[PDB]
């Protein structure tokens, strides 16, 4: 009979250097680098396989809540309490553009696959779509009635998903700016994170009632519910891990990384080592490697590797 | 310094 695999993620490196809470870590699409953002106003670049610090990128006037890579691994965009996003050339560290228009903290950001567009979400309750080349805002979606906790493009860039403390996940046509679907729950707990699945057919959404859910957004149906972790206070990133076994990965307010079997919903591993909330996790594009990062009483990033 | 994501609700 087949025997289901469980992962065996083990700590390989701890990445110290930020001087305040780390807010977000992301692997570059080419697998070579990890970028981190922090409340210390800095972006740092690290080797993905050895954790070696490479450079610091600076210029935001206030702390940073998110960072994201372009698909060519050459650009980053960051989202800051200074109400701007900045586009950076990673090789030179230079700020290429400052994206202005939000009226409150910018909280989340992402490029589309072609990386000609950036999507942002803000405490100002809007989602903005920006032209990478000109640095100008192309559209403002009247998306939410509370802070926007996450924004993500699907695999061909034709759709955006946004989430908010207003309790909604909303699906947007990138080209027309129209909302094509709003997903609700009876009580509408705050939605603290959302992203599309790799195949673009599902969204994974976190709510501040200690729950993650996998939804078929087109069918409007919840397929899977993941529990056991703690998430009532922070916008914690979650991920689909696909390089080995098919897992859901998330941080947690008990300072652990949780890994569940996507289909059975069983917890298959908990990764311990951080000394504050694990606000961010990321999965390497080709290797079974997780990066995790934690808040003010920790200030570090950890790299973990599994055989499957 | 501070960042919105690092502050609890």
Swiss-Prot record, chain B:
It is found in: Nucleus. Signal peptide: none annotated. Contributes to histone modification. May position the N-terminus of histone H3 for efficient trimethylation at 'Lys-4'. As part of the MLL1/MLL complex it is involved in methylation and dimethylation at 'Lys-4' of histone H3. H3 'Lys-4' methylation represents a specific tag for epigenetic transcriptional activation. As part of the NSL complex it may be involved in acetylation of nucleosomal histone H4 on several lysine residues. May regulate osteoblasts differentiation. Interacts with PAXBP1; the interaction is direct and links a WDR5-containing histone methyltransferase complex to PAX7 and PAX3. Interacts with HCFC1. Component of the ATAC complex, a complex with histone acetyltransferase activity on histones H3 and H4. Component of the SET1 complex, at least composed of the catalytic subunit (SETD1A or SETD1B), WDR5, WDR82, RBBP5, ASH2L/ASH2, CXXC1/CFP1, HCFC1 and DPY30. Core component of several methyltransferase-containing complexes including MLL1/MLL, MLL2/3 (also named ASCOM complex) and MLL4/WBP7. Belongs to the WD repeat WDR5/wds family. This is WD repeat-containing protein 5. The chain holds residues 10 to 18 of 334 of the full protein.
């Amino acid at each position: 009979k087949p025997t289901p695999v469980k992962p065996n993620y083990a700590l390989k490196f701890t990445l110290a250097g930020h001087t305040k809470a780390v807010s977000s870590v992301k692997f570059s699409p080419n697998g070579e680098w990890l970028a981190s953002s922090s409340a210390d106003k800095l972006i740092k670049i690290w080797g993905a396989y050895d954790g070696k610090f490479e450079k610091t990128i600076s210029g935001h006037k206030l702390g940073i809540s998110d960072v994201a890579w372009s698909s060519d691994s050459n650009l980053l965009v960051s989202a800051s309490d200074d109400k701007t996003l900045k586009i950076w050339d990673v090789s030179s560290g230079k700020c290429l553009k400052t994206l202005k228009g939000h009226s409150n903290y910018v909280f989340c950001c992402n490029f589309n696959p072609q990386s000609n567009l950036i999507v942002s979400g803000s405490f100002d309750e809007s989602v903005r779509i920006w032209d990478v080349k000109t640095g100008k805002c192309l559209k403002t979606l009247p998306a939410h009635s509370d802070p926007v906790s996450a924004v993500h493009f699907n695999r061909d860039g034709s759709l955006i998903v946004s989430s908010s403390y207003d309790g909604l996940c909303r699906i947007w046509d990138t080209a027309s700016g129209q909302c094509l679907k709003t997903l609700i729950d009876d009580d509408n707990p705050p939605v603290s994170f959302v992203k599309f699945s790799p195949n673009g057919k599902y969204i994974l959404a976190a709510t501040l009632d200690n729950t993650l859910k996998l939804w078929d957004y087109s069918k409007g149906k919840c397929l899977k519910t993941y529990t056991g972790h703690k998430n009532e206070k922070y916008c914690i990133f979650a991920n689909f891990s696909v390089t080995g076994g098919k897992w859901i990965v998330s941080g947690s307010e008990d300072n652990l990384v949780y890994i569940w079997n996507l289909q059975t919903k069983e917890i298959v591993q908990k990764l311990q080592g951080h000394t504050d909330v694990v606000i961010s996790t990321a999965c390497h594009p080709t290797e079974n490697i997780i990066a995790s990062a934690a808040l003010e009483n920790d200030k570090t990033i950890k790299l973990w590797k599994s055989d499957c």
